[PDB]
Amino acid sequence: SWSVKELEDKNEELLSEIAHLKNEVARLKKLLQRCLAANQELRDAMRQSNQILRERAEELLHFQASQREEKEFLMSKFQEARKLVERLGLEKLELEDKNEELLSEIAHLKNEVARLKKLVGER
Amino acid sequence: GSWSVKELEDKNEELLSEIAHLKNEVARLKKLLQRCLAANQELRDAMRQSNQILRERAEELLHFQASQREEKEFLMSKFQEARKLVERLGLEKLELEDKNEELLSEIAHLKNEVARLKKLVGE
């Protein structure tokens, strides 16, 4: 059907077609190798994000427990002091009432002393 | 005119089988590159969500600690004022107790003087 020259021209055509397809394979392998390397950089950085996020969540749980331990201890110191103010103030009022009753006894004893001394400047 | 018609036809079949192999490689490498590009997009879309969540939580922690620091300032500043109030009331209570002991000694002396003055007038 086909001559020698026609088969040679088709051979020349197929060889140029093999050369083009081989440049595509080499181009697609360079692309795939960069994309696989880019996927490795994204996976190493995403691993670090989850790893820092886990580290910061575990140190925050122990920090909140320490803040609770410090907040309880300062609070109990404020309550012990406030109660001490209420007790010192009431004991101060009970001492001031007792002192004013004593002054009334002294004022009565002083009047009694003067009354008896006018009696002795007569006898 | 080196090669015959039958030799050129067998070579033609040979070049075609190489094109069929290269065409399966190109289609295979395009599926790999397309899957890898899609995987990188899923990693970059998730990386951006993590960074946006990580950015919100760092801003909610920055403002939360500022209130914790201000509640620690306010519960502490109340405890300092109470301690000052305890030390002041303690001095006022000690001088009221000294006055109470001063008054009781005065009463006992005035009563002895009253009895002595009553014995002079015979009351």
Cβ of B16 within 8 Å of Cβ of A14? The answer is yes
Instruction: Assess contact for A56 and B57: CB atoms under 8 A.
Output: no
What is the C-alpha separation between A42 and B46, in angstroms, rounded? 10
Burial class (CB in 10 A: 0-12, 13-18, 19+), B71: exposed
Chain A residues lying within 8 Å of B104, measured CB to CB: 102
Contacts of range A89-94, beta carbons closer than 8 Å, 24 or more positions apart = A89/B89, A91/B93, A92/B89, A92/B92, A92/B93, A92/B96
Across the interface, do A116 and B118 touch by the CB < 8 Å criterion?
Answer: yes
CB-based burial, B10-29: b 16+ in 10 Å, e otherwise: ebbeebeeeeeebeebeeeb
Residue in chain A lying closest to B78 (CA): A78
Ordered by start, the domain boundaries in chain A are 1-123
Phi/psi of residue A121, nearest 5 degrees? -95, 45
Neighbours of A72 (CB within 10 A): 10
CA dihedral A84, A86, A88, A89 (to 10 degrees): 160
* Residue B19 tokens, joined: 């094109």
**A3 Rama sector, left if φ>0, alpha if ψ -120 to 50, beta otherwise:** beta
d(CA B21, CA B81): 90
Partner residue facing B33 (CB), from A10, A21, A32: A32
Experimental determination approach used: X-ray
In Å, how far is B60's CA from the nearest CA of chain A? Answer: 14
Distance, first Cα to last Cα, chain A: 178
A49 contacts: CB under 8 Å, gap ≥ 6: B47, B50, B51, B54
All residues at 6 or more sequence positions from B32 whose CB lies less than 8 Å from its CB, including other chains: A32
Q: B23: closest CA among A21, A15, A10, A29?
A: A21
Gyration radius (Cα) of chain A, Å: 53
Q: Tell me the Ramachandran region of residue B122: left when phi exceeds 0, alpha when psi lies from -120 to 50, beta otherwise.
A: left
Distance from CA of B63 to the nearest CA of A (A): 15
Contact A11 B16 (CB under 8 A): no
Instruction: Specify whether the CB–CB gap between A24 and B26 falls below 8 A.
Output: yes
- Cα separation values, A40 from A12, A34, A50, A122, B18, Å: 43, 10, 15, 123, 34
Nearest Cα to Cα of residue A89 among B110, B116, B59, B82: B82
Of B15, B39, B82, the CB nearest to A18: B15
Q: Which alpha helices (DSSP H) does chain B contain, by range?
A: 5-121
Distance from CA of B98 to the nearest CA of A (A): 11
Location of structure tokens 């083009």: A20
Instruction: List, in sequence order, the alpha helices (H) in chain A.
Output: 4-120
**Residue A18 burial (10 A CB sphere; 0-12, 13-18, 19+):** middle
Resolution (A): 2.5
The answer to whether the CB of B39 falls within 8 A of the CB of A41 is no
Using alpha carbons, select from B101, B110, B120, B113 the residue that is nearest to residue A108. B110
State the Cα–Cα distance between residues A25 and B25, nearest whole angstrom: 7
